[PDB]
Design a protein around this ligand. Structure first.
Ligand code: HEM
Ligand code: HEM
Ligand SMILES: COc1ccc(CO)cc1OC
Ligand SMILES: COc1ccc(CO)cc1OC
Ligand SMILES: COc1ccc(CO)cc1OC
Ligand SMILES: COc1ccc(CO)cc1OC
Lengths: 307, 307
């Protein structure tokens, strides 16, 4: 009946991203029982935080890779499109498929961090080998560190975000979501001196107001031209929850994350951006570099608790 | 005349700490004029953020070391007590005296970060060599990562925080503040297994409600017994603005910062904690370690603009 709580809500101010590998082996029934109790604790603490701090608009999801699926469940069918993002390594840099993603969103860092910290203490280092912990935060005017607004054409509202973000009702794994994460490191030393016309050509929208540059006036390699894709007259939209991260005086960029009803909607955009559809690359990739990457599936709340 | 805006306000949810060295040489008059124009831009942007985002309760201060004082001004007398923290290196680990501190506080990360980033871009790499950038955040119930409440006996309200936090009216450098920063790295694996009785003996207050343990029933090396000091019947109080920082699965701790009307109020507590008064160390130092340290002076708003 219900999805996990990171897909439909919009405009979170904070996000914590924990990605890593499961240390419990396939035959360890007691370890897997403890693992699933820690999953239940996560869902219970989400509800408790929502009750105590409604202003947080808290959300959270636990998501699983195709390689770990048969370790964590023998009951739930593996989502039919799920595969390792490492299969894209021949053309997309930075792939680093992990077993598990925990994504937590909030309008307050204190409750975002509380849920993240309590969850990591529950699972513990003996269950999860955490490879990446990212503290994302929204900036003024929802701008990415390129200083373009990020989110203008993100689908709005529960109806469209259910349509594009969640597996359809009646289908196997209904109300789950395919998930893609990818940490980008921005080269702002290179980007900042670029003329405004170059920056707008690169993105495909105007910088101040995020007005779309007419298709016939912007490069086919502009970011918007690379990612605004359709098949059979139907748009391949996705639900993005990306946030800025990092140090002003150090490494910084965009922690990209997308949720989708079909992995194909995400993968086709990756083929477009990274040169597999027409041999051409996204202009944005001259200024930013992906350094991690993973595909997951976030089960419905029911299937999460029935693994 | 008024102070810079990080001393009197309480209970900030976010703080950014930027510490580093001045690249402008004492002979470079045009570079120093540009440096002071960037100081002016900082004060103006604080006012503008305050107007646009009253909910941020924005605050900020630029602070100067004794070593850099006569580079940045030949007009304002050097504060009488200002000295390098490296003079404490014989007994206090982690000293790392820098020329400049910029401390920004907010109840929203987006405006905290906007002011910090805009300021760093104004000064630029040509003027500042940043050695440390810390993103502090308040946790639930204002608890330090030891999970004790941090702030119970901090002076409350404008009157007491002016008395203890700011140089007294009529004195040289009136309404400025002596500043001490010190980044701690916590060893929570050593702390978590201690029984509550040991944790409470270590701090000197109860954990759940921060009730003071009577002085004759706690060790003289408890943190409260080390820092609740007096001379001549006057309490050596300070104004703390410390915040947690760091990664759940990595390095984390407390970004300590104190403001005081007199550097001696801070230094006597450091002598106490680090064994220099009676040969005994603060019990808290079994569980956390300072890895940076600096003394500065935050001028009054008037003296900041008249450097
Ligand atoms: C450095 C990384 C990236 C940055 C800075 C970035 C930034 C942006 C910006 C500024 C926009 C325009 C405003 C908007 O409609 O949201 C945008 C649009 C979009 N981005 Fe990205 N993006 C990045 C990576 C990605 C990736 C990896 C994907 C796909 C997997 C993606 C998918 C999209 C989509 C679907 C749109 C909306 C296109 C439309 O229908 O008009 N982006 N991005
Ligand atoms: C890891 C570093 C530290 C931690 C976790 C820590 C934590 C705490 C806690 C839990 C309290 C009790 C609640 C309160 O009244 O605020 C406290 C009190 C205090 N701390 Fe610290 N503290 C640290 C470092 C320092 C340092 C370096 C100083 C001095 C330079 C300092 C000065 C004080 C003072 C003055 C008090 C109030 C004592 C009183 O009058 O009752 N602390 N600290
Ligand atoms: C789940 O417990 C909490 C969640 C959020 C807050 C914020 O006040 C406090 C909580 O426990 C004290
Ligand atoms: C590495 O030092 C810096 C990097 C970036 C900025 C502003 O974008 C400022 C820096 O130092 C002042
Ligand atoms: C566009 O400039 C601003 C927008 C929002 C804020 C705080 O929300 C501050 C701004 O400029 C200081
Ligand atoms: C290094 O990995 C961890 C460190 C600390 C915690 C919770 O305290 C969890 C970790 O991994 C799950």
């Amino acid at each position: 009946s219900m999805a996990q709580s990171t897909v439909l809500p919009m405009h979170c101010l904070y996000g914590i991203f924990l990605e890593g590998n499961l240390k419990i082996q396939k035959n360890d029934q007691e370890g897997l029982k403890k693992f699933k109790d820690n999953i239940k604790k996560f869902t219970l603490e989400l509800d408790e935080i929502d009750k105590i701090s409604p202003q947080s608009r808290i959300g959270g999801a636990i998501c699983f890779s195709s390689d770990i699926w048969d370790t964590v469940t023998k009951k739930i069918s593996k989502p039919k499109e799920l595969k390792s993002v490492n299969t894209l390594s021949s053309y997309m840099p930075g792939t680093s498929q992990r077993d598990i993603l925990i994504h937590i969103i909030s309008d307050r860092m204190d409750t975002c961090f509380k849920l993240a910290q309590d969850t990591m203490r529950n699972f513990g280092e003996d269950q999860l080998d955490i490879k990446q912990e990212i503290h994302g935060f929204r900036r003024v005017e929802e701008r990415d560190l390129t200083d373009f607004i990020d989110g203008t054409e993100n689908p709005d509202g529960d109806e469209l975000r259910t349509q594009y973000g969640l597996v359809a009702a009646g289908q196997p794994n209904e109300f789950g979501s395919y998930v893609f994460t990818q940490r980008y490191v921005h080269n702002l030393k290179k980007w900042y001196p670029e003329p405004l016309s170059v920056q707008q050509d690169t993105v495909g929208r105007t910088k101040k107001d995020s007005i779309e540059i007419p298709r016939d006036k912007r490069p086919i390699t502009s970011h918007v031209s690379r990612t605004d894709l359709s098949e059979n007259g139907k748009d391949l939209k996705i639900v993005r929850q990306s946030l800025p991260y990092g140090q002003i005086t150090g490494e910084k960029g965009l922690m990209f994350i997308a949720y989708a009803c079909s992995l194909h909607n995400i993968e086709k955009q990756l083929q477009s951006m990274f040169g597999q559809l027409d041999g051409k690359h996204d202009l944005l990739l001259k200024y930013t570099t992906p350094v991690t990457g993973s595909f997951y599936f976030a089960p419905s709340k029911k299937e999460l608790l029935e693994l």
